[PDB]
Design a protein around this ligand. Sequence first.
Ligand SMILES: [Mg+2]
Ligand SMILES: [Mg+2]
Ligand SMILES: [Mg+2]
Lengths: 388, 117, 213, 230
Amino acid sequence: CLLSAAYVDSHKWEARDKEDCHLADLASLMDKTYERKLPVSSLTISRFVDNIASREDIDHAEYYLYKFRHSPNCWYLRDWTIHTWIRQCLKYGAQDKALYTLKNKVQYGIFPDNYTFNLLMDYFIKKENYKDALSVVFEIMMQEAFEVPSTQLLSLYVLYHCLAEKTDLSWEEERNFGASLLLPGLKQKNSVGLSSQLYGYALLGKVELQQGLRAVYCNMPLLWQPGYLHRALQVMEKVASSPEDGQLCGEALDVLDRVLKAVTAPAQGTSEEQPQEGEESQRSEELVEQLDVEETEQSKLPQYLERFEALRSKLQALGKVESESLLTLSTQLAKAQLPTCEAEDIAVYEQRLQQWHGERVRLIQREQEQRERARQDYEARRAAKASA
Amino acid sequence: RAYRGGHLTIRLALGGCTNRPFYRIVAAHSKCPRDGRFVEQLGSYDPLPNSHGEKLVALNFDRIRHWIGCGAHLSKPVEKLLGLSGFYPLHPMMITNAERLRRKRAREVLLASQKTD
Amino acid sequence: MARKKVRPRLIAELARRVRALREQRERPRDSQRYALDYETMMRPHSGNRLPMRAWADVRHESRLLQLLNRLPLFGLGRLVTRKSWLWQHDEPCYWRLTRVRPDYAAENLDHGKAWGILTFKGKTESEAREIEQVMYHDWRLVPKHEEEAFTAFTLVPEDTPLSVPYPPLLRAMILAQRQKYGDTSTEEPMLNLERARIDPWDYPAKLEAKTKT
Amino acid sequence: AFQPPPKPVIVDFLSPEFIPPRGRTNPLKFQIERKDMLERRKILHIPEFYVGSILRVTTADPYASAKTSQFLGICIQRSGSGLGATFILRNTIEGQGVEICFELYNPRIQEIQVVKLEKRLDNSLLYLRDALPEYSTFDVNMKPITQEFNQEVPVNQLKVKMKPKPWSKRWERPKFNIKGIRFDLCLTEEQMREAQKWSQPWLEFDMMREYDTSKIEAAIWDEIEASKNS
Ligand SMILES: [Mg+2]
Ligand SMILES: [Mg+2]
Ligand SMILES: [Mg+2]
């Protein structure tokens, strides 16, 4: 949230509105274009979102959002239009419509792969938006826009929520919480990224071990390879070259994984008796993804347990990076690098706004010259009407 | 007759007599009937053996290779006959049918042995 | 053919124009054309029922446009693969998407036509080809963290022989042909396979018009 | 299920039936009839439409397959005073022109929908019977057309062709005062001069046969406003 302190938006946002617009004539014109089924530009939709006056205008802009981009010019949506619409949503609601338009992420599909992802979270933290900001991380992870320095910003909030998470996770929770740490968390400079990867792999392996392999990549942007416990163990094995680790949350979650895999083997009617939906329907539509000699993970539990027990002893014997809590360690590390990333993101944002403004006037000039040449052609033909 | 398309195919026109088949190995259009108009006759095939126990197959290899180079397609029995003659490699369908026949003979021998004791 | 008493038929010519106009004005859009009923496996538009072997992947997988709709720029430079390729070919086979035009008439936006670069069995083609079988329910997407790892392919030279023995009858024909002219060389004739290389059935074909040179 | 973003917005009548006739009928009857017709309009939405506009009417037909019967056509004329106002719709179906005279306040009418609000050059176009079938043919499944209020109901200035004589009426007589018929291609100069013998120029300047209803219309509008506020 410290980014928005030095990234004051009210000063530069009010310097971007140069459209000075209203209602009636262009409302009629575009309703006529879509009565005639004619594609239009994103210049106009940027122009209107540049002149939003109220939340009634926001809802108008939403029903708008919902009756054009099904025209031929769907791909030509400009980037700065997304920023303008996000700023207008922040002007009034800041909390409800932006989340509704992003949770589907395909229905509205703003696709703001820019600094707006960090900006929305920074604005969310002002009210601290506990349940409101949880869903946004899932959609950012789905969009896979982890090129700007947002990794630490999202890792702070997911670790805020993980401590508060004290419940029995369901099938969807074990998938989304596990997937919200590998793609988002990729920092190799600090132990936070490695701990996030170890935590995410452990939770992702539970779905494969309990339900099936297809469900982890049916919708999540994950990999179909059966090896996820091995990916959880390889980051621990990398300790021979990496001196700094988490060694607390990953170990605790691997303890849960090993006790879950150790209680199901002797007791088959205790934990595995949760599948009581249907038998013949599942048998007729059963899918065999793995081969017969593909070394199924179900028979590798004694191997996994020995590897984990051997690695956890050596990590404490040589690494000794056992911290008191991962959240308090990540809080002081993520906020330390925020002043470093603000200075590297300010220049790129300043050039992005300049290039977007340069494209706006180019599109305006294109429309003006097309209109003037159409007028010249119409006047020339009317002066000397020569047809057939 | 006029056709919208089709390709030249070297096939067998079954021109013969009841309970006495006789094939003419001929190159003809794909959309023409079996016993209809053809381009050029190549050879003859007699399914039933003669008094010497021999099955006569006639091949005009000089015209066959010329038409195949021109782009004439071949049918499965045509390929089988060419593989038997040796002008073309043996068709793998013949090999798999021979393997199936050998397996059937082995099964019959096993059944005969188990039905005797 | 050509007679003195040929009647100048006009209704037949006008019917060609009428059918040409109705072909474009009433052109069925690809969305409802490829719409699918997941219960009876029946196409509402054409009325044809899907193959029995395809009943599993339709219910257990997704098509290209059903996964490309959630990407920011409709997958510019992204790599997409197929379940059939992943199963049959251990070597990486992917399409690098360079341009996509989704159909705007679909309410759910899960239909469209895309182009891209084909890299099948590790062989990279230096030409742009239209993507085939978009409506198939076998497409899968690779993540960014695995984009570089999936491209890891090793170039292993082929062990296919370049020459094969001739069939016995043709070999005897060649031996007699050269012997009659008087060539005493008893060298073994071989049939070359340099130009006999053929693509597998899983290799997609191009959908662009062939240019006659 | 993408959201499609259209139009940015970036840019900056008394119905004829309410007119009482010229007779000396007591105003109490007119007031009662106006009250009843306003009560009927409270339930049945009667839109604004002139002569020449195209309407679709839904009627309660018991003997049809469905209880709703749809009829679309152009309004030939509107006539009547008060609750008994009627309008004539004309449409050519399969080469057979059909004209139906509907009542505005008949309870069997389910819905009246104006698909094309458009005026014409004549207050009463009864000549469509003698006109060409092209001017009476209208698609039943046409879509409604919505217009802006600033257009002020544009009037369609269309010259209509005519069938050869005879006609249903003598449309060339001055008593009809028709400008929408292309007479120069259907009648000759001698016929045009002959038709002028029935002209009555004094009726335009009689100054006594005119009907002034300014105060009556004001009172009716006040009553309508009071009923709406009620
Ligand atoms: Mg016979
Ligand atoms: Mg078919
Ligand atoms: Mg009469």
